[PDB]
Amino acid sequence: GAMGSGDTQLFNRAVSMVEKNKDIRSLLQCDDGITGKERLKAYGELITNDKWTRNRPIVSTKKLDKEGRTHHYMRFHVESKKKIALVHLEAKESKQNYQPDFINMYVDVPGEKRYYLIKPKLHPVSN
């Protein structure tokens, strides 16, 4: 396990960006010092069903699609200062690149508009 640390890597890489993104932090109510300094947490789908295998734990649904790129569809949940948030990242593995390319990545926070940390190629160049 964890040998395919891509999800593991991406989780940390994805989570770091979302945790530290001001926009997301604002969504996450990440105002440190508001009531002392509060703690954030990040993990895959929590109690969704039973225990660990529930829905989407910290994983990327590895698909080696027609693209010729491994597709990383990864979601994880985080605890904000005041809310519990869900983070969804779509990455693709180039070929021999160190990390997969991030196509899209966004944060789902209850009561907050889904924030797109990373914008997918929504329009084909022209738009």
Q: How far is CA 7 from CA 35, 39, 67, 71, 76, in A?
A: 33, 23, 19, 11, 10
Domain 1-127 part of CATH 3.40.395.10: no
CB contact at 8 A, 53 and 39: no
Rounded to whole angstroms, what are the CA distances from 102 to 40, 115, 122? 23, 15, 13
Q: What is the DSSP string of 46-72?
A: -SSSSSSSSS--SEE--EE-TTSSEEE
- If one counts every other C-beta atom within 10 angstroms of the C-beta of residue 115, the result is 19
* Solving technique: NMR
The domain segmentation of the chain, as residue ranges, is: 1-127
